Symmetry: D2
Subunit: 338 residues, 4 copies
């Protein structure tokens, strides 16, 4: 029978890792979750009991050398992405990596070289908004010329207040954590790069974040290479739920993706007025996008086609995020290319 089953090994079984693992094991066509790596025991036992994973490992290199797998999903903390990407490729495995690709520009370029030396292997970064139905619908309108050339993009990513308490005592920075997907969306929609940025921020609700070098809310203005404008807001304290919204203003029109984060098709009317319930967290909002990107990765290997999300999209995402962080600490305009 034609085009068989891709056996996948996963590393990282935190919240996001468990989503990918569960999806691969139960919902994704032509895929099997064969192996898992974690150095937390309870996580490996979860993988065996809940998902019936056959091979467990305490060490990533041990998994890639010995497990019966064709591909890996890297969902470890960001500091490990580059070394795990390189090892997997060197052992002849296809690679899906969560964002960001890495944290250090020099180290990222070393990985770009390794990736280029394995052109026969698929490499995909987890920019899942590119697979979200609403984002894709908007991209289609833009590609068809329906709003003309893009003059301004505004994107907000604000985590729910429900997670603030855990964060306070729980980073890498606000823009690195929260805005990388927004940076990618800007590049994806425009085809252009970010030139210079200024970013400001505030810890009003939780001033303890000041001493921790963290931010609860930040905003940025960005000028792109052709003088295109972009506005970012990132935050960790949205009272109404998970607020991810992207606005595109063009010469012929305007559109918004999730102007408000509608949960479903239910409207409630009571003494409080007219109420639309909201989506509450990222797994709820982006459930479909996660499944679609996972399936796209599996199909890319089976059909030997490139998905079009490159190490370069990863590098630029990290670079712009670093530039935003630097602009915030200096409180001055920073050029991204520097």
């Amino acid at each position: 029978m034609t085009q068989k089953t891709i056996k996948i090994g996963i590393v990282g079984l935190g919240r996001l890792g468990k989503i990918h693992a569960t999806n691969i094991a139960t919902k994704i066509q032509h895929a099997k979750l064969q192996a898992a790596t974690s150095v937390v025991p309870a996580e490996l036992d979860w993988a065996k009991k809940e998902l019936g994973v056959e091979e467990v490992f305490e060490d990533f290199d041990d998994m890639v050398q010995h497990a019966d797998i064709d591909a890996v999903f890297i969902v470890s903390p960001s500091g490990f992405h580059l070394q795990q990407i390189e090892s997997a490729l060197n052992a002849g495995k296809h690679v899906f990596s969560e964002k960001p690709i890495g944290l250090d520009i020099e180290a990222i370029e070393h990985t770009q070289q390794v990736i280029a030396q394995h052109a026969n292997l698929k490499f995909q970064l987890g920019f899942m908004r590119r697979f979200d139905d609403s984002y894709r619908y908007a991209k289609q309108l833009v590609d068809q010329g329906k709003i003309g050339d893009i003059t301004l993009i505004r994107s907000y990513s604000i985590d729910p207040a429900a997670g603030m308490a855990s964060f306070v005592k729980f980073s890498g920075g606000l823009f690195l954590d929260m805005s990388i997907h927004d940076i990618d969306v800007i590049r994806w929609f425009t085809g252009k790069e970010i030139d210079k940025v200024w970013a400001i921020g505030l810890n009003r609700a939780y001033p303890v974040l000041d001493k921790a070098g963290e931010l609860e809310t930040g905003a940025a203005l960005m000028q792109l290479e052709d003088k295109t404008m972009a506005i970012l807001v990132a935050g960790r304290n949205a009272a109404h739920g998970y607020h991810v919204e992207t606005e595109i203003i063009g010469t012929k029109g305007m559109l918004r993706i999730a102007q408000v984060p509608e949960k479903n098709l239910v409207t409630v009317m009571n003494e409080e007025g007219i109420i639309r319930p909201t989506s509450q967290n990222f797994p709820e909002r982006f459930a479909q996008a996660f499944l679609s990107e996972e399936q796209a990765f599996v199909n890319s290997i089976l059909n030997n086609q490139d998905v079009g999300i490159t190490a370069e999209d990863g590098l630029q995402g990290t670079k712009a995020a670093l530039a935003l962080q630097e602009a915030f600490e200096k409180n001055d305009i920073v050029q991204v290319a520097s």
Copy 2:
């Protein structure tokens, strides 16, 4: 100087009467509130102090015979409308009357005759939705042919729950009280008459209304002369505010007027979700429409033009409402013309 000041006398200084009186005295161009009639003393003192009305009367005929007025606003209880309309016309005064025109078909036809014998005097019924900006905008689309021929109209009029307690111990019927404006809207938009109706109702939240021969919620289905369909819902127990909504389905499109009763342009987002505050009562929702119909009445006299709301619109409104009430009591289909 050209086209002077219309002096107006008012009878009825309940909630609605006070709105008209205040508007005429302070906001309406080319009008003066000259006289007021009421047999509640406190009301006449209010009219003198608050509005500086010059002539007060305890008797309507006394006012129309002796006051220095050109026109009257009849805002008395519905049982008095016909006799006050006739008296005012016989004394040579222009007449604005609140709905309904009257309660008894035979008595209404007697008044139609009196009105016909005074063709040089203006007569206007208070169907204020015809002057509401949103209703007028929809009428314009319909007249321009933008939704084609009308196949179905659904109209809801539901008073806020906040008034239920006072109503319980406080009628004429639900459809007479609440649906007359909806009946007029149906006739206004279509140009057609209502043929047969069935109406049902329920006193779920306040079953004490059963013994009082009143209804807290009722619904009706109506077939118009050309087989056009209409649906009515009337109620006294809306939790979210004052719900007045009209939906028109046509062969080429559909529109809704106040799908939800938005208060203003403010959206609130908090832990409850996305909230739109609502309008709470009729004076808030129809403030503009009241002012516009009052000004139209005054201008109709000054410019000697007919506004186009006739005693016949009044008769048919009362007739259809009676038919709905009869259908409800019999629990059977009733033909309106009978």
Copy 3:
């Protein structure tokens, strides 16, 4: 390994049949599409090529007697449902049947008996709205007591105008075709039965439907056993897309499910105003619900649990729809139990 793979045979490979078949073959866990029955050759070849179905049949009884299947999906025209349900159960197969269960009350009761004689086999009717995320969310609010007791339900099912031309030359009636899901929704939310109904209708846009004994738009008012009110509208000519909307008015609140049929989270702003794109047809709107009901059927067999959609829900749906049709032809109130 525990709880294996349910092999399914399908009959009916029209539009809806192909959706179920594709889903079962590619997306549903623990299921295999093993066999297909059709007497259109092209359909069987589609099933073999596209879905790799192993066993094809020209005759339903041949499939149920000889194919290697544990369960059947009946997606044939409604006139065949009862005889295929009985045959499948008699051959020891679990049964999913699309709506309606059947068309003749007497014949339906015969099938109810056969079903009762096979209590160890699962039987499920395709009322997919019970599995839709938005309907389930509303049901949850209702069950939690959040809108109090239900006083009125309004449900609209209107097919897109895009299908009118094919329908004209293409029935069973409007209420049978379009309103069965609405009838089920009413029963599901309330727990109550429908007592008496009146239905009217019109063929304004396409009067050729008059001679065919069909309806393009119809409306109905229904009184339930406890004097609960329900309003239905069914149609085949919605200009804006596929309009399926359910409104529930309670003593403490109100909710609407898909007040407007939003396609996604994209809002467009151009010279036409503010635009929300709409879902266009049933497969788009109810994609999730179809997958969920299919998975629920498969899991019900594996876990030996009843889903709770019975032959009785089927009987009552057909009965009320027949009553609506009779009320329309007589233009009079009809009691459902008669």
Copy 4:
């Protein structure tokens, strides 16, 4: 009789001047439009014919010295505001002035001194958003503590594309023209001043604006004195109508004023999807606010109360706008106080 009629003279009978003049003459209580000044003949003839203005003048000082007026409305081009304000106050007239107060900081401080020397005369600047029902409703929520302390304000003012052609051949700058009301809104809601700003802009749709030192779209990021953040967008090319929107993010919630610029309560559904018509221009959107601010000015004189909009609100508005313009030309962060 108590508290008489305020006689008003107006200068400036362009689009905005005609709105104020018409309102004062026909709608405003206790006011009379007595005199008009213009050096365009047709404008004075309009004032006499259309509004029955008694005294016309070609020279502003001639009007203030000789006309029978108690107060003046200054609706001349911005370059004349300061000299006309001073002259009116010196001749003992109450003053309403449109924004901006003036263009030159030094000249503005000279006028502040003149204003201080006439403390017995009312002075009011035309920041009409402070009188808009939706803005006032939001201010009320903020004052009541309902969204906590304000962390970010985003305000957009975008003129309709319908006016671009006339503008191209038709300035003072984009931020001066379009963003002064937004600056005032920020100060009004927060009580805080703007510290530093960066502004960027683009002439994508109409690059001819480059040579004219004008902007079609601009964006700005602002840091306020307590590290509060603000985002501005100003433009002249909105395809969907007049887009004025203000978003306030607080520690406990978020609100938007006119997230989309809804025209009325009508929703249209046709082949294009679900459509909300939009307001098209400033006179339509802010009709109510203009009437309210005019009435407030008249009442302030009659009741000898201060409205609370000062020359200082004017100075700071102009200062911040100049800072935004300077930041744009330098493409660098500018401190407002410098």
